[PDB]
Design a protein around this ligand. Structure first.
Ligand SMILES: [Zn+2]
Ligand SMILES: [Zn+2]
Length: 71
């Protein structure tokens, strides 16, 4: 990558986005065990991850579904 350049937190229309922060893949990323998941791609730092977990990892968007807006 680039040694260092100001102007972070920017989403370019050139490259797509997956992670929740909607940013271009970078650093370490894992594939949500849930295939159906349209993202199946999230950053570590974002998902408070230090290293590839030796266990099924389900994005915070899948594991948290129960609970509809209205009752
Ligand atoms: Zn992210
Ligand atoms: Zn998922």
């Amino acid at each position: 990558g680039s040694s260092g350049s100001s102007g972070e937190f920017a989403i370019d229309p050139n490259e797509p986005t997956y992670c929740l922060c909607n940013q271009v893949s970078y650093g370490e990323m894992i594939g949500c065990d849930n295939e159906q998941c349209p993202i199946e791609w999230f950053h570590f730092s974002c998902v408070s991850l230090t290293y590839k977990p030796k266990g099924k990892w389900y994005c915070p968007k899948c594991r948290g579904d129960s609970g509809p807006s209205s009752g």
